[PDB]
C-alpha cells in the first residue's frame, strides 16, 4: 500500500480502474501506472537476459572486429542518453530542494534507466570486443522500450491538446527526444557488423553464407531464397553447392564420441543415447522450450475467436474494443510461425548430427578389431545394419519431442470442451472416440485389402516376367497376339478384383475425409437435441468445430510413432553388441614389424603355440626357429597341415598362447586370395606411391605385363576389379605379385600365388624377381607352396607336420637324409465419362458450400420463450444435406473407379503400343532387355499411383477455390486482397517445383558410393591391416561420407523455407478477412463473420497441405510426366501392310533369281553386294558361301517381306513371288533357325499355330524323326507351356526337335536358314544323316560351315569380296581358294 502513498500524499491517482480504461471510448492508462509499470516493463527484461547471454558469449570467442564507425556512434549514442536522463535526475533534485514537495515516483523511476542504459553500452562494446556481427537480443529489447515509448507518446500527446492543458515544459521534451532517439538507434541497429579480423575461409571460395546473416535473414531463410532463384533456370549440379562450417565434418564430430565412447567402456552399460545426454543433450533444451510456446498459441487463438464473437453479438461495445481484437490475433499468428518452423530446423540438424557420428564409430571398429571373432554373415548383418541403423536415425529424431507433447494438448483440449459445451460434450467425447476407432479400423480394415491383393498384384508380376522373356529372342511368327490377348484377359480379371479394391480403399480415404463433417454433424445434433434450456450459439457451435479441427491431427499421428520408438529399440541392441565387443586383440604381441634397421636374423621364434580360438584346440605348438636375415626359405607341409595357420601367425593375425616371436624390417604379404579394388589398374598397381620412371617399366616388364596391358582395351588406364571387366586368378594374383613387389618392402611373404600361374611363366618369373636372380636378392623372402620343380633351386626348405616342425635343412641334406622327403617322393610328387467426374465434384462441393450456409442460417435464429421457433426442420435438412454429401463422394469414388478403367482402357492402348513394335529394325542395334524389361513392368506399376493422383489434387483445387468464393461471398469489399496473394503463392510454388526435383536427384545418386566402399574395404580387411596404411582409407571413406552429407544439408533449408514463406500468407488472409469484417459490423449477423472467420484457419491448414502433398504429388505430376517421357518411343517406319493374293503353284521346282543387288551394311557403310545378276535357272542349284553374315541374312530378309512391299517382284518357278501368296509363301518356306529353338506354349499347339492339320501324318513324321528328345525335355511334353523360346536343356536334341518340326510342317522346298552352322560336330553329323534319310525328296539349299559333309553339293559359288566368282567343281574353288574356304583358313592355322 506504499505506492497510494508513493504516487501522491493523497492517493488521488488509484491504479487500474475499468471506468478509465475500459468502459470509456478514449481509453488511456492513469498516470502512477504509466510512471512505474510501464518503464519497469524493458529494464527487468534486460536484467534478466544479461548474465545468461554474458556465461554464452564468454565460451564463444570468434573476432577482434575494431572500429567500425557503427559502434562508435552507437556508444555516443548510448553515453548521451544517460548523460539527460540523469540531467532529468539533477531538475527534479532542484524542485525538490527548493522546498517544493515532489512525489518520491519522480526519484526513483528515472534514475534506473540509465544504470539500464549504461549496462547496455556495456554490453554492446564486450560484443564488438568478443566479434559477433548479429545481435539477436538487443532487437527484442529495443522493440519493447519502443513499444513502451509509444504507448507513454499516445497517452502524453492525447492529454496535450484536449484543453488549454497545463503540463511542465521540461519533461514533454525530454520524453519526445528520448522516444525519437530510441526510435533512430533501433533503426540503426539492425544492419550488419563488418567481418572479423581473421576467418576461417582463408582458401575456400564456396562457403555457406549462413555463417555470416543478419538475425532477420536467419529468422526467414533468406539466403537460399537466392540458391533457389540462381539453380531455377540453368540446372544446379556439381560443386554449386557450398562446403561445411567445420561444426559438422566427421573429423571433429567423430573424435568426441569415440573418446567419449572409449572412456565410458573402460569405465563399463547405459546404451549410446545416454552418453549423447552429454554430449548431444546439451543441444536439445531449445527443443524442448520452444515447443510449450509453440503449443501454447494454437490454444490462445479460439479463446480470442471466442471473444471476438462475443463482442460481435454485443451492439453497445465502443467500437475501437473491436480493433483491439483483431490487432492481437494477427500478432499471435506471426509469432507461432517464427517458434515452429524455427524448431523443425534445429531438431533435424541434430538428427543429421548424429547420423554422421555413427558413420564414424562402425568403419573405425570394423578396421582394426574383431579378428577371427566376426562370425555373422559378412554382408547383411554388417553393412545392412550399417546402413538400416543410420536411415533409422532420422525420423526418431523428429518424434522423439512429441510423446510428451502429443497427449497434452488432447487432455487440454477436452477440458474446453466439457468446458465450453458442458457434460454432454462428454457424450461428445463418446462421439469422438466412436470415431477413433472407425478410422483406425477402417486403416486395420483397408490394411488386410491391400496385402491380400498385393499377393495378387504379386501374381501378376511373376507372370508379366515370363513375357519379357518370350519376346527377348523371338524373331518371326505371331503367336504374341494371341498370348498377350490371353494376358490382358487375366490382367482384366486382376482388373476387376482391383475394381474392388480401389471401391474399398477409395471409400475408406475419402469417407474419412469426410469424417470430420459427419463427427460435426452427430455431435451437433445430440448437443442440440438432449434434454432442453440449450440453445446453439455461434460461440460454443464454433468453438467446438475449430477444436475438432485443430484436434483431428494428433490423435492421427499418435499411431506409427510407438511402433517407431519400438523399431529404434530393436535396431539399438545390434548396435550395442556389436560396438560393445570391443574385446581388443591386437594391442602387441610382436616386437613391432620393424624395432631396428639391421641384424644377423630376421625372423626368430621360441617356444610358440597358437589356436584359431580359445574354444579349440592349439593348432601349432613347440615352434621354435631363427632364420637369418635376407635367405630364401621355403616352408612345405602336407593339404591341410595348418601351412596358412602359421603363415598367418607370422602375420601376427593367430593367438598367441604363448611364445617368443621377434621379426625385423617392413613386410609385405601376399595371399592366396586376392583382392581388387576398383579403380583404374595404374591406380591398383600403384596403391598410393607415385610414378617411378623407368621402373615402373622395370616392375612391368619383369611382371611381362606387356601383353597384359595391350590386350586390355585402355592399358594401364581401364577400371580394375568389379562394375566392369573381368580378369583371370592368374592376372590376379601377378597383378597382387606387381604391386607387392612396386611397394619395394623389406620382407616378401607369398601363400603359393603361382596356383594359377603357367609353369614356363612360373619359372620365368622365378628367375625374374623370387629367384636368386631376380633383383629382390638382397631381401626376406619366404614362401609356401606344394609345388615340385623349383624345391631343388631355393636355399633353405623347412617341413612342418601336426602343428610342430618336423625337420629342418637345405635340399642337398634333407635329400640325403632319404626319408621324409623321400617318402614325400616316393607315395607322391615325383622321383465422356471425365465431365461426369467434374460435375460430380460441383455437386459435392456446392453442397458442402450449401450446408455451411444453412448452418449460418440455424445459428441466427431469435431465442423465442426458452426455444428457437422450429428444429425439427432444421435438423432433417441439415441430415438430407449430409446424405448428399455421402452420396456425391461415393460417385465420385466410383468415378475413380471408372478412371480405373479408363486406366484399363490405356492398357489396352499401351498393348497396341506392343503390337506397334512389332518391327525390330531399330531393335537389332539398340540395347533390347534392360530398357523394355523395367520400361513396361514400371509404367504399369505406377499406371495404377494416376487414378490416386489426379483425384487429390482436383479435390484440393476445388476446395480452395471453394474457400475463396465463401470468404468472398461474405464481404464484397476484401476483395482487392486476393490476387497479389494469390501471384506470390503461384511464383513461390512454380519455383520450389522446380528447384527440389534436382536436388532430391543428388541423394539417390549419393547414397550408394559409401556403402559401397565399407563393403570394399570389409571384403580386404586382412591385406589392407597387413600393409599398416589404414589412415588413408579411413581418410577417404571420411572424405566420401562428407561428399554425401554436402548434399543433403541444402533440402530440409528448403522444405522449411517454404513453409516460412507460405505461412505468412495464411496470416495475412486471416488478417485481412477479419479487418474487412469489422468495419461493417452494423449490418452483418453473427452467422455471416463466424463463418467468414472460421474459414480463415482451416483455409491456411487447406493450403499448407495442398502445397505440401499436390507439390511433392506435383512432383509425382513431374514423375507421370517423366512416365509420358519413357514412353514417347513410337513412329517406326516397318509396317506389315498391303498384300498379293494370286493363285499359289508352289513348290515344284525351285528356280532362283538375283539381279542388280547392292545389299550392304548400315547405310554409311560400303556395298557388301555390287549389282550380282545370277538367273539360276531351275534344276541348277547355288552353294552361296562366303563370310559370316554376309548375304544369307540379306535372302532371308528379303523372303521376310514384313516391312512394306510397294515394290518387289521376283519370278520363281516361272511363277513370280508376287504370283505367290504372300503370308501362304513366307510361311510355307520352311525355315530352319540358325539358333535351334522349341516354339514356347503348349508344344501340341507350338505346332499347331492354327490347328488345322491330321495329328496322324504328324505321327508318322516323328516316327520318322528319331529326332525327339527335348519334346521328352519338357515335363508334360506336346501340353507342355514352354517359356523362353523353350530354352532350357541342351542344343543338340533342339536341332533334333528343330528338324522334327521342319519335317512336321513338310514342306517340299526348306530353305536351310543357318541351322548346320552354329551346331558342334556330332550333332551335325547326325541331322546330315538323317537329312540324307529322310529328306533325299526335298529340295535343300545346304549352307554349311564345316567340310564334314559339304561334298554332296550340287554347284558351289564362292561370294569373294561379295562377288560371285568361278561356279562348280568344288575341288577346283578349293584349288582357287575361296572366300567361304578363307574364312575357314582364318580360324586358327597353326
Sequence with gaps: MALRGFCSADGSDPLWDWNVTWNTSNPDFTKCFQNTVLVWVPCFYLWACFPFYFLYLSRHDRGYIQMTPLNKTKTALGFLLWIVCWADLFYSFWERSRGIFLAPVFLVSPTLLGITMLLATFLIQLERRKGVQSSGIMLTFWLVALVCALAILRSKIMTALKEDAQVDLFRDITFYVYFSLLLIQLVLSCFSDRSPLFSETIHDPNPCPESSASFLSRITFWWITGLIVRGYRQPLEG????????????????????????????????????????????????????????????????????????????????????????????????????????????????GMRIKTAVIGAVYRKALVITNSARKSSTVGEIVNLMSVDAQRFMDLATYINMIWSAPLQVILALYLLWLNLGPSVLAGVAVMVLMVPVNAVMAMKTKTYQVAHMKSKDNRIKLMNEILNGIKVLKLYAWELAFKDKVLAIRQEELKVLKKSAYLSAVGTFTWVCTPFLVALCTFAVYVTIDENNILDAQTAFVSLALFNILRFPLNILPMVISSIVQASVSLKRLRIFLSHEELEPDSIERRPVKDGGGTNSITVRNATFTWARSDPPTLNGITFSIPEGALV????????????????????????????????????????????????????????????????????????????????????TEIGEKGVNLSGGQKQRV??????????????????????????????????????????????????????????????????GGKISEMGSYQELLARDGAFAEFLRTYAST?????????????????????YWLSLWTDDPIVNGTQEHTKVRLSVY???????????????????????????????????????????????????????????????????????????????????????????????????????????????????????????????????????????????SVIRAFEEQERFIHQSDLKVDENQKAYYPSIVANRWLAVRLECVGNCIVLFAALFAVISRHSLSAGLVGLSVSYSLQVTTYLNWLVRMSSEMETNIVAVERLKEYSETEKEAPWQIQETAPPSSWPQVGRVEFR?????????????????????????????????????????????????????????????????????????????????????????????????????????????????????????????????????????????????????????????????????????????????????????????????????????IVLDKGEIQEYGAPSDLLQQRGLFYSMAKDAGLV
Design 239 to 350: 560443386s554449386d553447392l557450398w562446403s561445411l562450417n567445420k561444426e559438422d565434418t566427421s573429423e571433429q564430430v567423430v573424435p568426441v564420441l569415440v573418446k567419449n565412447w572409449k572412456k565410458e567402456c573402460a569405465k563399463t552399460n547405459p546404451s549410446l543415447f545416454k552418453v549423447l545426454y552429454k554430449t548431444f543433450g546439451p543441444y536439445f533444451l531449445m527443443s524442448f522450450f520452444f515447443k510449450a510456446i509453440h503449443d501454447l498459441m494454437m490454444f490462445s487463438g479460439p479463446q480470442i475467436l471466442k471473444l471476438l464473437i462475443k463482442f460481435v453479438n454485443d451492439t453497445k461495445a465502443p467500437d475501437w474494443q473491436g480493433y483491439f481484437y483483431t490487432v492481437l490475433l494477427f500478432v499471435t499468428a506471426c509469432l507461432q510461425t517464427l517458434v515452429l518452423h524455427q524448431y523443425f530446423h534445429i531438431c533435424f540438424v541434430s
Design 634 to 717: 621355403a616352408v612345405v607341409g602336407q593339404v591341410g597341415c595348418g601351412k596358412s595357420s602359421l603363415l598367418s601367425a607370422l602375420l601376427a593375425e593367430m593367438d598367441k598362447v604363448e611364445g617368443h616371436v621377434a621379426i625385423k624390417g617392413s613386410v609385405a604379404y601376399v595371399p592366396q586370395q586376392a583382392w581388387i579394388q576398383n579403380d583404374s589398374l595404374r591406380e591398383n598397381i600403384l596403391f598410393g606411391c607415385q610414378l617411378e620412371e623407368p621402373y615402373y617399366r622395370s616392375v612391368i616388364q619383369a611382371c611381362a605385363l606387356l601383353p597384359d596391358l595391350e590386350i586390355l582395351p585402355s592399358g594401364d588406364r
Design 736 to 801: 597382387s605379385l606387381a604391386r607387392a613387389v612396386y611397394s619395394n618392402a623389406d620382407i616378401y611373404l607369398f601363400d603359393d600365388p603361382l596356383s594359377a600361374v603357367d609353369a614356363h611363366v612360373g619359372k620365368h618369373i622365378f628367375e625374374n624377381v623370387i629367384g636368386p636372380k631376380g633383383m629382390l636378392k638382397n631381401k626376406t623372402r619366404i614362401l609356401v607352396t606344394h609345388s615340385m620343380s623349383y624345391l631343388p633351386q631355393v636355399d633353405v626348405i623347412i617341413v612342418m607336420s
Design 832 to 852: 465422356f465419362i471425365s465431365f461426369l467426374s467434374i460435375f460430380l465434384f460441383m455437386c459435392n462441393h456446392v453442397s458442402a458450400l450449401a450446408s455451411n
Design 879 to 1021: 441430415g438430407a444435406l449430409g446424405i448428399s454429401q455421402g452420396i456425391a463422394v461415393f460417385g465420385y469414388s466410383m468415378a475413380v473407379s471408372i478412371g480405373g478403367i479408363l486406366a484399363s482402357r490405356c492398357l489396352h492402348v499401351d498393348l497396341l503400343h506392343s503390337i506397334l513394335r512389332s518391327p525390330m529394325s531399330f531393335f537389332e542395334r539398340t540395347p533390347s532387355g534392360n530398357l523394355v524389361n523395367r520400361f513396361s513392368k514400371e509404367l504399369d506399376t505406377v499406371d495404377s499411383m494416376i487414378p490416386e493422383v489426379i483425384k487429390m489434387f482436383m479435390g484440393s483445387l476445388f476446395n480452395v477455390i471453394g474457400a475463396c468464393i465463401v470468404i468472398l461471398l461474405a464481404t464484397p469489399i476484401a476483395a482487392i486482397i486476393i490476387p497479389p496473394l494469390g501471384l506470390i503463392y503461384f511464383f513461390v510454388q512454380r519455383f520450389y517445383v522446380a528447384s527440389s526435383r534436382q536436388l532430391k536427384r543428388l541423394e539417390s545418386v549419393s547414397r550408394s558410393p559409401v556403402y559401397s566402399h565399407f563393403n570394399e574395404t570389409l571384403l580386404g580387411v
Design 1156 to 1356: 542388280n543387288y547392292c545389299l550392304r551394311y548400315r547405310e554409311d557403310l560400303d556395298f557388301v553386294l555390287r549389282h550380282i545378276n545370277v538367273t539360276i535357272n531351275g534344276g541348277e542349284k547355288v552353294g552361296i558361301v562366303g563370310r559370316t553374315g554376309a548375304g544369307k541374312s540379306s535372302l532371308t530378309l528379303g523372303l521376310f517381306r514384313i516391312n512394306e512391299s510397294a515394290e518387289g517382284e521376283i519370278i520363281i518357278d516361272g511363277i513370280n513371288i508376287a504370283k505367290i501368296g504372300l503370308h501362304d509363301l513366307r510361311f510355307k518356306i520352311t525355315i530352319i533357325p540358325q539358333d535351334p529353338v522349341l516354339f514356347s506354349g503348349s508344344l501340341r499347339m507350338n505346332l499347331d499355330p492354327f490347328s488345322q492339320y491330321s495329328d496322324e501324318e504328324v505321327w508318322t513324321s516323328l516316327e520318322l524323326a528319331h529326332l525327339k528328345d527335348f519334346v521328352s525335355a519338357l515335363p508334360d511334353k506336346l501340353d507342355h507351356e514352354c517359356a523362353e523360346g523353350g530354352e532350357n536343356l541342351s542344343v543338340g536334341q533342339r536341332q533334333l526337335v528343330c528338324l522334327a518340326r521342319a519335317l512336321l510342317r513338310k514342306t517340299k522346298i526348306l530353305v536351310l536358314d543357318e541351322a548346320t552352322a552354329a551346331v558342334d560336330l556330332e550333332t551335325d553329323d547326325l541331322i546330315q544323316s538323317t537329312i540324307r534319310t529322310q529328306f533325299e525328296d526335298c529340295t535343300v539349299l545346304t549352307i554349311a560351315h564345316r567340310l564334314n559333309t559339304i561334298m554332296d553339293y550340287t554347284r558351289v
